[PDB]
C-alpha cells in the first residue's frame, strides 16, 4: 500500500587527511538502490538494485551532480558548525541528514521527512506541516533563522510534491517484482538445552520482507517478557531480513510456550510450538 523513499547523508571531517568523508545512500522502503562515496576510486552515483540499473547516463550524471552539491554544502556546514559550537579543526565531527517522501494509496503525499543531526544529536528537523522547523539547541536556531529567511521549506516542499513522488512512483513501477513484494518469513522453533533443568527455545523468522515484523512469546497464552531475548532485525545480505526470539524455559514446560509472529507477508498471524 504505502511506500517510502529516503536519502541518508553522512559527512565526517578528518583533520590532517584532507576533505571530509561523504557517504550517502538511497532507499525505497527497505531496499537500497543507490550509493555515493567520495572515497570511491571514481566518486559517482551507483546502482545497488537491478531495477534502477536500467536508467540512462543522464540519471547518473545528474544524480552525481546533486550528490556532490550536497557534499559541498555539508562541507561548509561543518566549518559553520565549528564556529557555532566554538570547536577546533583538529577534531573529527559528523553531519547526518535523512530526507524522504511517503507515497500513499491514493497516490498523494502522505508524509514528509527532512531531519539533520550533528555529532549524533538532533540538530534541526522539518515539522509535520512541512512548513516550520524544530531546532534542538541555540546554535541550530541560527540555521532555522536563515532557512526561514530564504524560504527553504518551500523549495524542499516543492521537491516533496514534485520529483520525489514521481520518481518514487517510477521506481515502484520499474521494480514491482521486488519492491511491491511481501515475502512471508520462514519460521521455526529450535531447542537448546542450557543444563539438565533449563533449555532455551528459539523462534526463527527468515527471509522476510519488508523488515517490519513482530515476534512474541507466550506461556499458557500469556505474553512472556521475563528471561526473553529478542535480537535486532538483521539483513540477510540478499535483500531479506532475519529475526529470532529466545525464551529460557525450565525443562518439562516446553509444550506450554508458543511463538507469535506478525508479518505483512502472512494472511494471519502465526502461532508456533516446538516440534521435536
Amino acid at each position: 500500500g504505502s511506500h517510502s523513499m529516503k536519502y541518508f547523508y553522512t559527512s565526517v571531517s578528518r583533520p590532517g587527511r584532507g576533505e571530509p568523508r561523504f557517504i550517502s545512500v538511497g532507499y525505497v522502503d527497505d531496499t537500497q538502490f543507490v550509493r555515493f562515496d567520495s572515497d570511491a576510486e571514481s566518486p559517482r552515483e551507483e546502482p545497488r538494485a537491478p531495477w534502477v540499473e536500467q536508467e540512462g547516463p543522464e540519471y547518473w550524471e545528474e544524480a552525481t551532480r546533486r550528490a556532490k552539491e550536497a557534499a559541498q554544502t555539508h562541507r561548509e556546514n561543518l566549518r559553520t558548525a565549528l564556529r557555532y559550537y566554538n570547536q577546533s579543526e583538529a577534531g573529527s565531527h559528523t553531519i547526518q541528514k535523512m530526507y524522504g517522501c511517503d507515497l500513499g494509496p491514493d497516490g498523494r503525499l502522505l508524509r514528509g521527512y527532512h531531519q539533520s543531526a550533528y555529532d549524533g544529536k538532533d540538530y534541526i528537523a522539518l515539522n509535520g506541516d512541512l512548513r516550520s522547523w524544530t531546532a534542538a539547541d541555540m546554535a541550530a536556531q541560527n540555521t532555522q533563522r536563515k532557512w526561514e529567511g530564504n524560504r527553504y521549506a518551500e523549495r524542499f516542499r516543492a521537491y516533496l510534491e514534485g520529483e520525489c513522488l514521481e520518481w518514487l512512483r517510477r521506481y515502484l513501477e520499474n521494480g514491482k517484482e521486488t519492491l511491491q513484494r511481501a515475502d512471508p518469513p520462514k519460521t521455526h522453533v529450535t531447542h537448546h538445552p542450557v543444563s539438565d533443568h533449563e533449555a532455551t527455545l528459539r523462534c526463527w523468522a527468515l527471509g522476510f520482507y519488508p523488515a517490519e515484523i513482530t515476534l512474541t512469546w507466550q506461556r499458557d497464552g500469556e505474553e512472556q517478557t521475563q528471561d526473553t531475548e529478542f535480537v535486532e532485525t538483521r539483513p540477510g545480505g540478499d535483500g531479506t531480513f532475519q529475526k529470532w526470539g529466545a525464551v529460557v524455559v525450565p525443562s518439562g514446560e516446553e509444550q506450554r510456550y508458543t511463538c507469535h509472529v506478525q508479518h505483512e507477508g502472512l494472511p494471519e498471524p502465526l502461532t508456533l510450538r516446538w516440534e521435536p
Binding site: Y59, R66, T73, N77, K146, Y152, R155, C164
Partner: peptide, 11 residues
Amino acid sequence: IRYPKTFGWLW
C-alpha cells in the same frame, strides 16, 4: 530522486 540544490541549505 535526490534533492536538487537551487539556493542551498547552509547552516
